[PDB]
Assembly symmetry: D2
Amino acid sequence: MKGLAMLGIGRIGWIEKKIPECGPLDALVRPLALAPCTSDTHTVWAGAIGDRHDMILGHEAVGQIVKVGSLVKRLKVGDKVIVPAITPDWGEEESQRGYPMHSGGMLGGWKFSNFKDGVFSEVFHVNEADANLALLPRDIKPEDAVMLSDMVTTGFHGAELANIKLGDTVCVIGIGPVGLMSVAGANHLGAGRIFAVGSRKHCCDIALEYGATDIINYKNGDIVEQILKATDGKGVDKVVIAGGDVHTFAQAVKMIKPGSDIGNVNYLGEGDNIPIPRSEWGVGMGHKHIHGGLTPGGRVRMEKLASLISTGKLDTSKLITHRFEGLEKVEDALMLMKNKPADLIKPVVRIHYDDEDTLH
Amino acid sequence: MKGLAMLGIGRIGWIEKKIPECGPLDALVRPLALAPCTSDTHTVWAGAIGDRHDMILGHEAVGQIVKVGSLVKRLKVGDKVIVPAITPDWGEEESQRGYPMHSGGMLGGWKFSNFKDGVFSEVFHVNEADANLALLPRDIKPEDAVMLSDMVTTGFHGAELANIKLGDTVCVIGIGPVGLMSVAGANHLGAGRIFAVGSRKHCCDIALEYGATDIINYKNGDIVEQILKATDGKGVDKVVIAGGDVHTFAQAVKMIKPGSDIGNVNYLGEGDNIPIPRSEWGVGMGHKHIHGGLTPGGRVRMEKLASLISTGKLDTSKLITHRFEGLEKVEDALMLMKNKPADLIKPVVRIHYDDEDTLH
Amino acid sequence: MKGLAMLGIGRIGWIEKKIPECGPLDALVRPLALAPCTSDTHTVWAGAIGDRHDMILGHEAVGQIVKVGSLVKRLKVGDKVIVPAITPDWGEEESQRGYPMHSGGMLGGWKFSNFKDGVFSEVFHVNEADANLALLPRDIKPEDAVMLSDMVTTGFHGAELANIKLGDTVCVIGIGPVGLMSVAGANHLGAGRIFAVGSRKHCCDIALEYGATDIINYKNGDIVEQILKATDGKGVDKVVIAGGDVHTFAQAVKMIKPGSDIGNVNYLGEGDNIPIPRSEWGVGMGHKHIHGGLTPGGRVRMEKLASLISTGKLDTSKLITHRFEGLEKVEDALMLMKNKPADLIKPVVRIHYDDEDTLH
Amino acid sequence: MKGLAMLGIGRIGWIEKKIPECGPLDALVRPLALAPCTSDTHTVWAGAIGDRHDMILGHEAVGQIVKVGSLVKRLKVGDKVIVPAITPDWGEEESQRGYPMHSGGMLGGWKFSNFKDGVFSEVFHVNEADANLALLPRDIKPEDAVMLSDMVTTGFHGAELANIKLGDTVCVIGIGPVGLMSVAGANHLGAGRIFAVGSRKHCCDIALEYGATDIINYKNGDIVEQILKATDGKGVDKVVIAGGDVHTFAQAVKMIKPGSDIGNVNYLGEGDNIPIPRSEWGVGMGHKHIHGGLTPGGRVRMEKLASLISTGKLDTSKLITHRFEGLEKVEDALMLMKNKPADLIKPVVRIHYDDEDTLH
Ligand SMILES: C[As](C)(=O)[O-]
Ligand SMILES: C[As](C)(=O)[O-]
Ligand SMILES: C[As](C)(=O)[O-]
Ligand SMILES: C[As](C)(=O)[O-]
Ligand SMILES: [Cl-]
Ligand SMILES: [Zn+2]
Ligand SMILES: [Zn+2]
Ligand SMILES: [Zn+2]
Ligand SMILES: [Zn+2]
């Protein structure tokens, strides 16, 4: 089979691999809808998580089951599924202690395009398929559902980590597709005033559609100073970090009240250390709690989030700026995430099969 | 000064009381908008919290400061304020351990029309005024803000106590004004499917406007059966109880999943015991957590909830069914909470003064 | 193979069952030390969880692996293990949402002697063995370790559900082996004054050894009145219920402060309803949170608790009052739990094999 | 009245100040036992929280009431009290949202020797005295109770912020008196294996007495390496930081598991930034939560912690290494904190009055 792989730091290409073996608890899946992610960009071109050799990329898919292991009970060949980017080993120590996204070791639940061949191939492998795949509800378009795999769940996790409470004033730093979902997540957790820090017109517009109330554009001056002026020197209640670099944490600390939470979901591609400013962190004692977490995954997470789409309470189609057709277009789609044109949020690639509606 | 008082069980009337003494941390307040509460109907006609002698009624007000004590620093004569129903003693033991609504003893933070003269008088007294009074934002009508004092905060507290998470399926039992605000609160905590259990059409339909997705009317059969059928026997993730009686808890237990939360905010006015069904409660072990709590109060609670109105994220005007003018009409309004017509959610009474805009 | 079974409500006896099938993730285990539980007396003689036929009893074992499935990675034939009473299906919906003891439905993680053949047989079956079996540390006696399976974990879980904080005054109601472990759990969560409500003399004496400070014996008068007198009317901070009947909940609510937690781990064997007193529960609003939960299980829970024994911080030997040798003696041991002589806390049965130290 | 003050960065001496004005909620207190703190050495000699003008030092006292305001209800002249280092304004915003130690702004609840005249004077002032002073239990020596003000509460807060669970393996970094209390705090939250990092022999032995199981001395190699050995490369579950410098955080991040908590209570006296290592922090995604908090204070905190002494479950006497008599000797005692001999944990100064037992 064919897949789009990381050949080495700074190098991608199409390669052939064997179809993966399906064990008793596994499923093999063919992609129906795919999206590329900024994270693969860091992994490939920054080498942020080490070198790789012929690792198939991608971790956002809606798919169709082509094979199930003998112990699979919830799924059958032909079923259409939402594939979460994080597919935990549910019995591992870290899962038993409440952190299934770190199953088997830090980031161990994030398999696809971390250290396991990802979803950009004709067939891919899902471990613990019953636990890790949600059936696609009939009222959700595949292109909308592929936003659940990573964008919705990560952006919402940023808001969860920021411990957002009813009526909180919140700042979301970085308004790419993950940040726009942190704006939506903060709004869904009861935030009132929401500052969205970004400068791309189309991203800023979308942030307002998801519940942002204030756009903070760095071209109008230091963003911390803008936030402080807007809040009469008091700062914000909670901060979500969904973009930027290691220096964004100092900005979050400087703009946030004491007794508060900073929720990072940004994958940090470079820099030895994240500098936390001593004085503004209350010289160690300001209760400015700092969180940085990988998204949850698995089927329950997908089902809960899908229910917001099905009930008309979450519209993920706003994230989709480019629509492609055919597996080969994932290469174009991924390059868009590297190049970042002004009109871009997320591309989606749709793939059709001759037996998509009869496969069993 | 005149106030509408409970003169004993089943008896109300206007009485004259001295203007209360204003100590260093206190303020005296005149009403601008007032609303009656079903709780005062329980108190007066059912004797649900014991007999009272000459206690002024009412605990939902927007007001205007007429006097402040010597140590008050945030308020001045003439300021317009949102008065919360619950006005804690912030340094008491219960406050120090995170339960300020029970300051000084169970329900101790609920003073007005519990054991302290309430807001239905020409002037009323607020303890710890800097802590307990929020300024009325210039963009909120007094009639809309009076819903913050008790309806919005209590309804939202039901949703907080039910521990609602992103994508949860929720049932709210009881759809009077508190129940409607529990639906709104559940929706603002990220609920997906929300079942609202009530029968009167103008309440049921307003629930849909606040985020309900399913209306359950007991006239179509047992509401537990209806909810189970709707969820294919799985039940709902979380339940808020915002009305009914002691037997509503058994319904909540029978319709909810194991590993769940039941958040009650209903004031139970009769019955020796609340029966919890042993078998459906997992014979003691189903992790169906049962919570029953008095609303939070004080200035911060009001300020946070008000910000949801100011940002256009909450409309409380839909709760108001009747609009009266003049302090005397609190008597007519309270009598409506007692006679319970089809027309009714909440009356509000507006009171005007010659120097309403010039007092200083 | 021989096992001791519930043949019907009120009837037990030895039966023959086929050696269980061992699937890819499973292990087959032979018992090395076993203990009987009060729960099995409720199940058999009270019919508290419905009728059963031919169900092997028991859910407390230290055992030795005799067979592992083809995908078992952490365990080998011959390994000595602590078997938790609760052996979850870690990928089921409930596990993914943080309640693995309810995997598959309420109480679903409690398999042994609930709806699956338990540990009182020559060989028994463990699902998801890598996830559910802890290796027996070399410095823990099998008889001390068997107290981890259910007594320590359930007792500690009562303390966890009671949300015990540093310096809290706590009451544990019911001082059988589980309650004694709730005393020990409360002490290990930082409780200061601990009241232990019991009347079997030896249980009372042992409670003082595990960190109780005040034995409350009903023969001295109403236990609620005693605790209210001892706390000059203010009540206790938190309450664990580890014994008694449905009416024990009313005692907990009457002795506890508002803004507090009642953690129940008692398996309730009869009564249609648990009555919660309306007035003392703050007429629905006292924030007296009521929790009732099945113990955690799996290997992580066992490993954590076992580390308290290995570090010299928990002595479970004080629980053992009766010692037997030979598999047949589990019948004698279970009959003690039914009859409850004054002498009794917990019996243990030791089983030996010729190749106990050589099996591989 | 005489007091020992910071006269400027690097300078201390005795000055005369006016006996403070006692408002309606205030009390004036004379010292009976006093202790110096490392924090005052950072403040005076490192200028870690800015320059100060004539600020009386000290924030650890057992005292006796000499004057109470007209609205004080729990205290009378002559009463002996435990004075917490932190004395919140309980009605401020931060207190209302659960962070009373930040009342009025970051570190605002820490008044004594932060920005308010401290306890090293003949008389000092306590705001909100009913809320902020605990009566000294008759069974606790003044020298032992003075350890509650700051050492016990801050150390225990370190363990609280580190979110320690039953059976967790914990590392406490820094074993001065606050660190010894973090060890005790961890043991009182149910930790099993506890690693105490320090090299001073007397401190190391005392750590073993408070529940440490392993002592990690840096002279035997990089402490991160030592801890990873002893945990078979998996790391510890939780880390408390109770000493060191800004570089200690990187050590904590490197020794801890993903899905974990680092609880800092150390007052960081120098360095622009705290570097968090990007890779070992899971490239922003490891769920290694970082907390840094000022101790709780007020009466309830002191009463709960004092109950641990009164019940025989905490011995603070082991912290006292030097004993002085007479108010003058607080200068000598603070100088020991600055020069730190091998001999030292905490000095205490006892102050006697002719009417100590007769004042009313
Ligand atoms: C939000 As991700 C799975 O690209 O680190
Ligand atoms: C303050 As109320 C019990 O009427 O919501
Ligand atoms: C496993 As049990 C209900 O006997 O503690
Ligand atoms: C009150 As302190 C910062 O010396 O622990
Ligand atoms: Cl002090
Ligand atoms: Zn991604
Ligand atoms: Zn009311
Ligand atoms: Zn049992
Ligand atoms: Zn100090």
